[PDB]
């Protein structure tokens, strides 16, 4: 049963949450090959583990940059949580370690590319295609929230397509274990729930809002709220108005009115039934939730792979020198990493 699965899930998580793994590799055990993507405090690179021959994705975070931006707690959150979770649609952390200059998180390499790249190239996903991805997000959110985790950065850029055409969620940078409400203004302008923007406390319902934006963007090819400047996006989010493309089915539009619901008391995922409000919605009638979890449903598309270490599904980025100082930078701040 779901209840018993979540109970075993919680216990596995709590053991790792209480006793995180640390310093389980070092930099010279990897050949650094190519940058796969970028963010605020550095780089995700394709790497090759010399001893096993495996390729991995190494996330490199500059300690000094983390501190200057006041992201210490978020980064410690990111590593503590990602090393503790286990779910089919969450990227596997394999090794973590740090040196004088950087923090390192070595993940399984997800070769299919970002959902972002495929979505922009194709324009938009058909409803059955979007549903397939959305279903994996729904189950993943069920898992994460049961652990008192809030994810807080859902977007196509943080979603990777694996070799079976399934979703792998990456970037736990804003993830946080919190039982009450929380207040940090974080996320992505387009995906922000009204309550985040309005500097109210918020809770896990912001993730359900973010799901509505994601589904809308997959199915339309553009997000429900866009404009050239962040401030203009926020006005649109807050206003309580969304227009749907005429090609959206009635079930889709109905699902979206409930997800993109400004009133927290009426938002799907946040009512007494919780996630079942969503799982049992008409839009998801054809969804086999168990089969999705076991990865037995055939993907709407399997990405092209020209073999091992292939980066054809990722954009090119300017490579830069990886410099390690001879002096330990910010040792005290990152003790538990």
């Amino acid at each position: 049963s779901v209840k018993e699965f979540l109970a075993k899930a919680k216990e596995d998580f709590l053991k790792k949450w209480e006793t995180p793994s640390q310093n389980t590799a070092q930099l010279d055990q990897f050949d650094r090959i190519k940058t796969l993507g970028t963010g605020s405090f550095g780089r995700v690179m394709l790497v090759k583990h010399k001893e096993s021959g495996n390729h991995y994705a190494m996330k490199i975070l500059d300690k000094q940059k983390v501190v200057k931006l006041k992201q210490i707690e978020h980064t410690l959150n990111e590593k503590r949580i990602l090393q503790a979770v286990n779910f089919p649609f969450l990227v596997k952390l394999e090794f973590s370690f740090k040196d004088n200059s950087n923090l390192y998180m070595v993940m399984e390499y997800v070769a299919g590319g970002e959902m972002f790249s495929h979505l922009r190239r194709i324009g938009r996903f058909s409803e059955p295609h979007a549903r397939f991805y959305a279903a994996q997000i729904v189950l993943t959110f069920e898992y994460l929230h049961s652990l008192d985790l809030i994810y807080r950065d859902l977007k196509p850029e943080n979603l990777l397509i694996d070799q079976q055409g399934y979703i792998q969620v990456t970037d736990f940078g804003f993830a946080k274990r919190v039982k009450g409400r929380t207040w940090t203004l974080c996320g992505t302008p387009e995906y922000l729930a009204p309550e985040i923007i309005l500097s109210k406390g918020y809770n896990k319902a912001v993730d359900w809002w973010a799901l509505g934006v994601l589904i809308y963007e997959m199915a339309a090819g553009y997000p429900p709220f866009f404009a050239d400047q962040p401030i203009q996006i926020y006005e649109k989010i807050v206003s309580g108005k969304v227009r749907f493309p005429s090609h959206f089915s009635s079930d889709l539009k109905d699902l979206l009115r409930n997800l993109l619901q400004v009133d927290l008391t009426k938002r799907f995922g946040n009512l007494k039934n919780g996630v079942n409000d969503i799982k049992n919605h008409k839009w998801f009638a054809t969804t086999d939730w168990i089969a999705i979890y076991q990865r037995k449903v055939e993907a709407p598309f399997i990405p092209k792979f020209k073999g091992p270490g292939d980066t054809s599904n990722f954009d090119d980025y300017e490579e830069e020198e990886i410099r390690v100082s001879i002096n330990e930078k910010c040792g005290k701040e990152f003790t538990e990493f």
Partner: peptide, 19 residues
């Protein structure tokens, strides 16, 4: 069309997280 408006807008590329 709103698609044409999106495509002409400055936010069609990868979007940075904010904090």
């Amino acid at each position: 069309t709103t698609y044409a408006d999106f495509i002409a807008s400055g936010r069609t590329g990868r979007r940075a997280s904010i904090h």
